[PDB]
């Protein structure tokens, strides 16, 4: 498929995105490694970088090729709808990509974000209670619909 | 007139919230 | 599961039913309730409503001014510190065989306020003639909407439980006369309370007004320099609370003298030691005022001791106690999604703006 049919982007946008991808691909491998993203100072103290890369990496080979790059950034186009943004936010927490946020995933992802700002015991307690309150079907994990019920109004 | 008697106890032992590093997700101060 | 930290308990999700909470004769099973609440377990909403409303019905039949005789354990502010309330009963004696008087402020500040209310109300149902509860200034709509009790009810139960509590709080008595010796109130005196009859005549079944004797009973404080006054204004505007008054040592002594009382026992102000005895009255040789504060390490940072006052065999035994561990909550009971999503949005936007330059 042409990439403008796999994203919110037109051909002009694809070409520009290509120019940035090339600049980031330091070894002309045709894929971006985590190390290549980290070469940007601005991404330095950013706990979300690892998660975004993992989400972009749809074939799970640890790197981001140009198609993955385009489809990843597309999820943040101004032309993306509310549902797409909620889906991306959910994906931040759903580490193993099975479509549910488990207790362990929620803890690990929050721990990436909070660092030492909370003790593990404190963080576990608030993760547990978030899940108890949001888990409507009692399976101990958070579905996409359960997630949206919590955050849908935040915009 | 009642007699007053104080019965003591040990000091508090408790966890304090970590200092909040603004480079990470922080708990808002109460 | 894949839960990472087993070093803390996972709270029960099961909501206790009426059959689990009430025995066949309508008696609350307070031991089950204690254990479930200490685990941060919840009741079915209908069961919580039943405890609150049954307690209210009992309170509604009580007088504004209770008569309570020794032996009795008198307790000050609790402020939602449920895990300290558990220690309080160990220090003060089991309510199964100990008379209790609580001086109010069950809720706000601490994030286990509804557990405090449910457990104390259950105890009131079980021990209607030996466990007594007075109103504090936080037992109202105004403060509970400003502080966190209303939100606590919203997140753990619903606003129906909150409303039931507001009605129940309207029913709380305002004062006790203990051993025909001690006037016990949450806050203190009023320029409009000159005899005990002035308390008896009040209509307490309402949100406390911003002015007048009911307000003052709940809100007033002794002067900072109580007992060492430089003027002799008996009552002056309470610049700390923004309503009601500061009362002076001569104000207290004149009231005690007139009404042939020994002392005023009250709460309402944090104390590093959990208590404070003020200057002896010139007509009794006994402290004119005693503050009792039953919330150890208040706000998790004061590092104060708490105390109760056990009056028995003509001995007033002030028993101090220290704090107990309690579970963590984010401010305003915020869930971790609501908490982290803005940070997620900011950092992901940050990343991509810079990746795309
Ligand atoms: Ca490369
Ligand atoms: Ca890939
Ligand atoms: Ca998952
Ligand atoms: Ca679920």
Residue numbers in the entry:
A (entry chain B): 6 to 160
B (entry chain C): 205 to 234
C (entry chain A): 14 to 370
Paper lines:
Calcineurin (CN) is a conserved Ca2+/calmodulin-dependent ser/thr phosphatase and the target of immunosuppressants, FK506 and cyclosporin A (CSA). In contrast to PP1 and PP2A, whose catalytic subunits combine with different regulatory subunits to create a suite of distinct holoenzymes, CN is always composed of a catalytic A subunit (CNA), bound to a regulatory B subunit (CNB) that binds four Ca2+ ions. By dephosphorylating a variety of protein substrates in response to Ca2+ signals, CN regulates development, learning and memory, cardiac function, and the immune response. Here, we describe the first high-resolution structure of CN bound to a physiological binding partner: the protein inhibitor A238L from African swine fever virus (ASFV), a highly virulent double-stranded DNA virus that infects domestic pigs in Africa and Europe.
To elucidate the molecular mechanism of A238L binding and inhibition, we determined the 1.7 Å crystal structure of the CN-A238L heterodimer/inhibitor complex (CNA/CNB/A238L). CNA residues 1–13, CNB residues 1–5/161–170, and A238L residues 200–204/235–239 were not visible in the electron density map and thus were not modeled. A238L binds CN in a largely extended conformation, stretching from the PxIxIT binding site to the CNA/CNB interface and then looping back along the CNA/B interface to occupy the newly identified LxVP binding pocket. However, the structure reveals that the CN active site is fully accessible in the CN-A238L complex (left). The interaction of A238L with CNA at the PxIxIT binding pocket buries 886 Å2 of SASA and is mediated by A238L residues 206–211 (PKIIIT, the PxIxIT motif from A238L), which form a short β-strand that hydrogen bonds with β14 of CNA to extend one of its central β-sheets. In the CN-A238L complex, the LxVP motif from A238L, 229LCVK232, is bound to CN, revealing the very hydrophobic LxVP binding pocket at the CNA:CNB interface in CN. Leu229A238L, which becomes 92% buried upon complex formation, makes hydrophobic contacts with residues from both CNA and CNB subunits: Trp352CNA and Phe356CNA, which, when mutated, alter binding to the LxVP sequence from NFATc1, as well as Leu115CNB, Met118CNB, and Val119CNB (left). Similarly, Val231A238L becomes 97% buried when bound to CN, forming hydrophobic interactions with Tyr341CNA, Leu343CNA, Pro344CNA, Trp352CNA, and Leu123CNB (right). Notably, Phe228A238L, which is immediately N-terminal to the LxVP binding motif, also contributes to CN binding, fitting into a deep pocket formed by the loops connecting EF-hands 1 and 2 and EF-hands 3 and 4 of CNB. Collectively, these structural and biochemical data show that A238L inhibits CN function through a model of “steric inhibition,” in which A238L effectively inhibits CN function, not by directly blocking the active site of the phosphatase, but instead by occupying two critical docking grooves and sterically occluding CN from interacting with substrates.
